[PDB]
Amino acid sequence: GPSFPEPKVVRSQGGLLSLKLSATPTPLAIAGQRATLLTYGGSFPGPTLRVRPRDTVRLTLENRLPEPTNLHWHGLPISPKVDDPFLEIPPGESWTYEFTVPKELAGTFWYHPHLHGRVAPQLFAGLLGALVVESSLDAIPELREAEEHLLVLKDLALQGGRPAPHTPMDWMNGKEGDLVLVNGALRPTLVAQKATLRLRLLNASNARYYRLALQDHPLYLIAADGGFLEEPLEVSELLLAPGERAEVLVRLRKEGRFLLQALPYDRGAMGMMDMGGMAHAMPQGPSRPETLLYLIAPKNPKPLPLPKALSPFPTLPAPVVTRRLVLTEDMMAARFFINGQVFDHRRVDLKGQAQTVEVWEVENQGDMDHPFHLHVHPFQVLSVGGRPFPYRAWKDVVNLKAGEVARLLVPLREKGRTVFHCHIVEHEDRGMMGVLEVG
Amino acid sequence: GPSFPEPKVVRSQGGLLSLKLSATPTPLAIAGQRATLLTYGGSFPGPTLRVRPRDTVRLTLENRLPEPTNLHWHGLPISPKVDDPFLEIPPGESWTYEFTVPKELAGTFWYHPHLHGRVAPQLFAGLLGALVVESSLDAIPELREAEEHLLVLKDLALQGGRPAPHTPMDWMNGKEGDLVLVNGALRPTLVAQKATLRLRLLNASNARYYRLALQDHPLYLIAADGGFLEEPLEVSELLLAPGERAEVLVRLRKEGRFLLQALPYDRGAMGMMDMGGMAHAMPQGPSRPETLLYLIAPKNPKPLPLPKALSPFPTLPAPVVTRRLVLTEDMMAARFFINGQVFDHRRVDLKGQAQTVEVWEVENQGDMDHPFHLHVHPFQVLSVGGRPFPYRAWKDVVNLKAGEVARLLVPLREKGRTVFHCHIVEHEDRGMMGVLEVG
Numbered sequence: 001g002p003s004f005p006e007p008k009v010v011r012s013q014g015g016l017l018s019l020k021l022s023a024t025p026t027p028l029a030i031a032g033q034r035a036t037l038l039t040y041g042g043s044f045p046g047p048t049l050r051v052r053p054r055d056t057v058r059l060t061l062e063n064r065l066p067e068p069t070n071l072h073w074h075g076l077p078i079s080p081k082v083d084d085p086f087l088e089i090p091p092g093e094s095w096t097y098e099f100t101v102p103k104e105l106a107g108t109f110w111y112h113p114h115l116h117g118r119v120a121p122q123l124f125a126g127l128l129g130a131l132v133v134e135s136s137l138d139a140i141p142e143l144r145e146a147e148e149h150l151l152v153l154k155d156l157a158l159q160g161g162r163p164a165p166h167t168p169m170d171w172m173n174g175k176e177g178d179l180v181l182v183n184g185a186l187r188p189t190l191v192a193q194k195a196t197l198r199l200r201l202l203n204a205s206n207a208r209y210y211r212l213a214l215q216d217h218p219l220y221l222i223a224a225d226g227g228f229l230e231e232p233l234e235v236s237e238l239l240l241a242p243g244e245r246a247e248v249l250v251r252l253r254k255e256g257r258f259l260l261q262a263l264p265y266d267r268g269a270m271g272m273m274d275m276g277g278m279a280h281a282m283p284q285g286p287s288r289p290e291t292l293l294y295l296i297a298p299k300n301p302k303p304l305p306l307p308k309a310l311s312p313f314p315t316l317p318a319p320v321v322t323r324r325l326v327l328t329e330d331m332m333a334a335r336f337f338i339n340g341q342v343f344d345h346r347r348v349d350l351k352g353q354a355q356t357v358e359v360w361e362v363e364n365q366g367d368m369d370h371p372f373h374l375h376v377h378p379f380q381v382l383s384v385g386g387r388p389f390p391y392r393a394w395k396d397v398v399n400l401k402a403g404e405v406a407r408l409l410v411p412l413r414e415k416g417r418t419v420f421h422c423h424i425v426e427h428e429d430r431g432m433m434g435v436l437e438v439g
Numbered sequence: 440g441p442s443f444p445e446p447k448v449v450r451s452q453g454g455l456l457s458l459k460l461s462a463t464p465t466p467l468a469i470a471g472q473r474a475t476l477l478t479y480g481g482s483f484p485g486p487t488l489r490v491r492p493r494d495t496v497r498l499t500l501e502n503r504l505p506e507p508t509n510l511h512w513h514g515l516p517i518s519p520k521v522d523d524p525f526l527e528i529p530p531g532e533s534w535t536y537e538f539t540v541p542k543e544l545a546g547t548f549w550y551h552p553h554l555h556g557r558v559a560p561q562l563f564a565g566l567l568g569a570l571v572v573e574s575s576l577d578a579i580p581e582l583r584e585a586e587e588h589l590l591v592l593k594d595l596a597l598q599g600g601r602p603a604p605h606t607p608m609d610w611m612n613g614k615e616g617d618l619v620l621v622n623g624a625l626r627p628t629l630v631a632q633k634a635t636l637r638l639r640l641l642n643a644s645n646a647r648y649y650r651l652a653l654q655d656h657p658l659y660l661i662a663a664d665g666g667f668l669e670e671p672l673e674v675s676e677l678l679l680a681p682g683e684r685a686e687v688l689v690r691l692r693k694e695g696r697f698l699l700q701a702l703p704y705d706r707g708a709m710g711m712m713d714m715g716g717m718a719h720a721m722p723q724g725p726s727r728p729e730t731l732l733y734l735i736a737p738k739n740p741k742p743l744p745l746p747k748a749l750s751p752f753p754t755l756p757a758p759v760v761t762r763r764l765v766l767t768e769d770m771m772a773a774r775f776f777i778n779g780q781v782f783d784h785r786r787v788d789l790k791g792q793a794q795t796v797e798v799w800e801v802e803n804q805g806d807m808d809h810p811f812h813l814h815v816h817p818f819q820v821l822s823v824g825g826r827p828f829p830y831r832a833w834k835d836v837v838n839l840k841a842g843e844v845a846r847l848l849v850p851l852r853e854k855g856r857t858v859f860h861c862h863i864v865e866h867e868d869r870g871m872m873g874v875l876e877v878g
């Protein structure tokens with residue numbers, strides 16, 4: 001096979017991507033060992049769906065799990081009557097999602113379960129896959145001539161040949177695994193054939209963060225979760241929180257082997273200790289460094305020039321309301337709150353007007369990082385922790401460290417009921433989610 | 440009596456204004472004729488209540504009318520659980536309103552009925568009176584030494600010794616009367632004893648406008664509906680719409696007789712005509728000019744200097760929502776709407792948060808002027824018809840000519856349910872009113 005493993009791609013044909021996927025326990029070979037995971041399409045990750053704007057997607061999901069499940073089309077600005085976070089597909093039953101890909105859209109998106117209370121174990125077990133929306137921008141020489149790869153960053157822990165069960169501490173912290181994988185492979189080797197790489201990055205982990213750095217190289221950010229930046233942005237490293245995506249150009253500078261690493265990062269996960277009459281919570285501290293892949297540069301690399309521009313960001317109408325959403329924690333209870341409440345599917349929390357713009361101020365009053373996700377309505381991050389964002393682009397997840405306030409500009413698009421929640425999926429399952437109704 | 444008639448004043452005593460008023464049909468002498476009006480306290484206008492900040496008001500209203508009634512404390516930022524627009528006092532019954540006068544308050548306010556569907560005939564018949572909140576600012580020499588008078592501008596029409604009944608055309612236009620009175624007197628004479636006058640002005644008419652101008656003199660605006668300006672503003676004339684108040688200084692320039700007039704003004708009232716196969720609506724055009732009073736200046740008037748400053752206007756927090764309220768008409772039906780709906784006491788139209796500030800954009804899409812009033816929450820008019828307001832002061836009524844948009848800054852104060860409506864009271868009775876709930 002290709003030294004670099006990537007999920008199989010399924011492309012739309014004549015403007016239609018019609019596909020039947022099954023969610024099923026699947027025996028497979030994973031990181032040198034045999035395990036049974038929960039998969040879509042018999043693979044981990046699931047197949048990459050590759051579409052263009054205005055395509056019709058017709059995806060029939062067959063549920064072959066012992067529990068109910070559904071799909072969240074993460075990041076897609078489509079109707080919540082399609083991307084329905086309240087829908088339940090019972091074991092043995094099927095449901096067809098049908099939608100048109102929005103005309104003004106490009107980037108890396110993904111699909112995974114969103115049945116409240118069951119997301120963390122289902123995602124941790126292997127249920128996820130990517131969706132790429134191809135753009136006319138991909139035809140510019142500086143992108144067309146780059147070597148393109150998808151990197152699905154997802155960790156795993158195995159016990160008795162199955163995904164390790166959630167502990168009480170896992171529900172508090174979000175579960176992380178010792179197998180830190182790229183496209184379901186353990187430290188794969190990418191032997192570059194071109195000097196410029198275009199990497200689409202997806203954090204599909206329950207809770208693990210990836211503080212990305214390539215040895216000896218900067219990265220050039222060209223897209224965030226939901227679309228291109230206006231121009232490339234040079235960065236020395238790039239933090240991807242759970243649920244986030246990014247696309248970078250890598251400009252290989254000389255021959256050799258370069259490690260792509262997840263550098264140490266402290267997201268505020270907690271342990272317990274007892275030092276002679278305690279038994280109380282203590283910080284886990286920064287993650288241990290991980291090597292994600294080995295990048296081998298070609299001979300005498302001469303990278304392409306960077307594109308001078310990407311996509312102009314839309315000029316948005318002036319906002320008509322400001323919202324404040326405060327995140328808090330009860331760590332020992334593994335309970336998580338938005339404005340003092342836990343999720344209730346029957347309760348509407350915010351009511352907004354389609355085609356208006358809102359300012360959402362999301363404040364983290366907890367001690368853990370929380371990555372805040374909104375369905376259906378991509379947003380522009382204005383600032384976080386009081387620091388202006390250095391680029392304009394569509395995002396749908398924004399990470400907040402302890403005490404930080406994020407200011408978001410949120411155009412309301414499709415009408416209907418949808419949700420917002422922490423994308424530490426254990427925290428969502430444990431209540432950190434609310435309901436937005438757009439009319 | 441004093442050549443200049445003004446309503447009797449009732450003052451708070453030791454910080455308490457405790458008074459029993461009856462609403463009653465009362466035979467009286469009015470403009471040289473005998474008529475029975477509906478009055479508070481046996482007079483037209485009702486007694487002027489004069490209080491200071493932090494006073495307690497305890498007003499027991501006894502209903503001696505054949506129909507139910509209640510009181511609206513127009514312009515007072517108090518709780519809508521006291522100023523209750525939904526309360527009904529049945530015939531023969533009594534109700535005690537008790538409240539504390541807010542500490543940061545000054546100006547001319549008023550009281551009148553607000554029982555939906557019955558306001559226009561009750562107000563037209565004589566049920567209203569003024570309330571003055573005295574200020575420590577009244578002690579500055581430039582105000583203390585002026586000669587002060589209240590001018591209640593209210594018109595009336597009589598038929599068979601009683602207020603003339605409402606016609607169908609009256610419900611469409613708002614009713615105006617041929618007797619254009621000041622303090623219930625017909626063209627009284629004010630023989631000034633001082634060269635500077637301080638006049639508190641109240642438009643307590645159902646629908647008549649007063650385009651005020653004093654012959655040969657400017658007016659110096661020093662207060663709007665609900666408080667002082669920051670400094671006096673010189674004007675050549677001053678339009679008072681129904682429900683509005685103002686306070687002006689007049690600086691008498693030489694000996695002589697000067698008319699205070701209501702100059703011609705076209706508020707968009709309509710008539711009907713038939714010119715050989717028509718029977719359709721036709722503009723009434725501008726009102727005929729009216730003389731309101733004769734002002735006699737004293738000998739060798741030497742007016743005081745104007746105060747350099749009045750009261751600094753509060754710096755308000757940034758707003759958290761923008762509202763749009765559109766006024767429309769169905770003239771032939773005498774139906775009037777806000778955002779396409781008529782009033783329903785059971786329906787909440789806007790929900791806001793106490794202690795936040797909102798921007799309200801009120802747009803008149805009708806052809807008549809409509810004077811928009813909000814209970815409980817005084818506002819700052821930013822602009823009307825796209826023209827910046829030339830002063831900062833609290834208002835609670837804002838006039839909109841055909842097609843004009845007013846932009847208001849609305850701090851939400853007391854919690855509870857209250858209303859907003861056109862102060863053309865016939866239009867309110869006929870549906871032009873909505874419900875705001877503050878929580």
Ligand SMILES: [Cu+2]
Nearest residue numbers: 072074112243
């Ligand atoms: Cu997601």
Ligand SMILES: [Cu+2]
Nearest residue numbers: 370422424427
């Ligand atoms: Cu969280």
Ligand SMILES: [Cu+2]
Nearest residue numbers: 072114373375
């Ligand atoms: Cu979600």
Ligand SMILES: [Cu+2]
Nearest residue numbers: 511513551682
């Ligand atoms: Cu009023």
Ligand SMILES: [Cu+2]
Nearest residue numbers: 809861863866
């Ligand atoms: Cu009106």
Ligand SMILES: [Cu+2]
Nearest residue numbers: 511553812814
């Ligand atoms: Cu009112």
Ligand SMILES: [O-]
Nearest residue numbers: 072074113114
């Ligand atoms: O999700």
Ligand SMILES: [O-]
Nearest residue numbers: 511513552553
């Ligand atoms: O009123």
